[PDB]
Design an enzyme around this catalytic site. Sequence first.
Site, PDB file in Angstrom:
ATOM      1  N   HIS A   1       0.830  -1.181   0.083  1.00 42.59           N
ATOM      2  CA  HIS A   1      -0.015   0.010   0.035  1.00 42.59           C
ATOM      3  C   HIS A   1       0.932   1.279   0.099  1.00 42.59           C
ATOM      4  CE1 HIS A   1      -2.675  -3.033   1.988  1.00 42.59           C
ATOM      5  NE2 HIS A   1      -3.293  -2.512   0.867  1.00 42.59           N
TER       6      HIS A   1
ATOM      7  N   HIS B   1       5.417   7.143   6.199  1.00 41.78           N
ATOM      8  CA  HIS B   1       5.287   6.816   5.035  1.00 41.78           C
ATOM      9  C   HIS B   1       4.836   7.997   4.053  1.00 41.78           C
ATOM     10  CE1 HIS B   1       1.538   6.492   7.014  1.00 41.78           C
ATOM     11  NE2 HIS B   1       1.116   6.837   5.784  1.00 41.78           N
TER      12      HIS B   1
ATOM     13  N   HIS C   1       2.022   9.107   0.731  1.00 42.58           N
ATOM     14  CA  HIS C   1       1.182   8.860  -0.462  1.00 42.58           C
ATOM     15  C   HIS C   1       1.380   9.836  -1.456  1.00 42.58           C
ATOM     16  CE1 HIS C   1      -1.437   7.013   2.487  1.00 42.58           C
ATOM     17  NE2 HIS C   1      -0.841   7.932   3.371  1.00 42.58           N
TER      18      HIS C   1
ATOM     19  N   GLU D   1      -3.220  13.657   0.229  1.00 45.23           N
ATOM     20  CA  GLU D   1      -4.561  13.228   0.722  1.00 45.23           C
ATOM     21  C   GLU D   1      -5.099  14.605   1.204  1.00 45.23           C
ATOM     22  OE1 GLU D   1      -3.513   9.772   3.313  1.00 45.23           O
ATOM     23  OE2 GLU D   1      -4.156   8.873   1.698  1.00 45.23           O
TER      24      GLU D   1
ATOM     25  N   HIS E   1       3.534  11.184   6.186  1.00 44.77           N
ATOM     26  CA  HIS E   1       2.954  11.177   7.128  1.00 44.77           C
ATOM     27  C   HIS E   1       3.796  10.452   8.300  1.00 44.77           C
ATOM     28  CE1 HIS E   1      -1.120  10.867   5.256  1.00 44.77           C
ATOM     29  NE2 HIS E   1      -1.001  12.088   5.345  1.00 44.77           N
TER      30      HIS E   1
ATOM     31  N   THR F   1      -5.946   7.119   7.259  1.00 44.32           N
ATOM     32  CA  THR F   1      -6.516   7.307   5.798  1.00 44.32           C
ATOM     33  C   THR F   1      -6.583   5.873   5.285  1.00 44.32           C
ATOM     34  OG1 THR F   1      -4.512   7.893   4.871  1.00 44.32           O
ATOM     35  CG2 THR F   1      -5.935   9.687   6.070  1.00 44.32           C
ATOM     36  N   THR F   2      -6.041   4.863   5.907  1.00 44.96           N
ATOM     37  CA  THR F   2      -6.235   3.469   5.137  1.00 44.96           C
ATOM     38  C   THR F   2      -7.020   2.678   6.238  1.00 44.96           C
ATOM     39  OG1 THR F   2      -3.951   3.014   6.447  1.00 44.96           O
ATOM     40  CG2 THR F   2      -4.118   3.689   3.834  1.00 44.96           C
TER      41      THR F   2
HETATM   42 ZN   LIG Z   1      -0.659   8.025   5.458  1.00 45.23          ZN
END
Ligand SMILES: [Zn+2]
EC number: 4.2.1.1
Length: 257
Positions: A61, A91, A93, A103, A116, A195-196
């Site tokens: 992911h 991590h 995005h 995001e 993040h 957010t996941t």
């Molecule tokens: Zn994140």
Amino acid sequence: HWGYGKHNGPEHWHKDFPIAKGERQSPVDIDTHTAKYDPSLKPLSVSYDQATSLRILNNGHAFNVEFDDSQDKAVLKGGPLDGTYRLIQFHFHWGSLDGQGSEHTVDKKKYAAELHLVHWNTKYGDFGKAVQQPDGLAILGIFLKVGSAKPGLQKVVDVLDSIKTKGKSADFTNFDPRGLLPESLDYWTYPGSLTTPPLLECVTWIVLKEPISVSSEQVLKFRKLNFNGEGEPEELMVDNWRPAQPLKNRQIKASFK
Ligand SMILES: [Zn+2]
């Protein structure tokens, strides 16, 4: 089987994770014309001098840079927070194109990527306990735009070939997350969620005002990662972002005038 593909992306997550339609979901759009300065907010305190990175993992992911969180080595305090929050991982995005990937958005602007830095509240003892609490996590979010290179990111970029596919990890010691911060710690804050999946509503979000710059070559290397495992059909790890969710009965507060 959640993901960011053609048939398992964010708009599907609610079937297995019904809080996806909850009251405190993230990310959100940050409207700079309605977020209000809050003089009761404090500077934040980012104490990363003693951080112990250990490993980097492609989880299918994103990739996580993991830390020792078995002592108060790398902590976030102050700002909107009560008490002390331990860095566990960071991590990103990111997008398939530079015009997308973040995001959170700022007045509907999407950045190329978003970092993040995830921290858990030490009052709850372990991450798994913390995520069950409304004030369990503090996530510091940092926007990335494409321009100059970020020198402090290059050692991340250069290890990505070793973790191309889902489930691969590599030793990743002695990485300094201070090299990913912008100049200013001015921020917006609001209560929200992971957010996941599992999308738990356990996060105090702290989103920095100032983006960092990364180069086009650095982001290109993010976009060579794979969602799939080794030996499986290649699916580039791109567009691993959830879009903005309804703000509902929340206010976004600014640390700055
Ligand atoms: Zn994140």
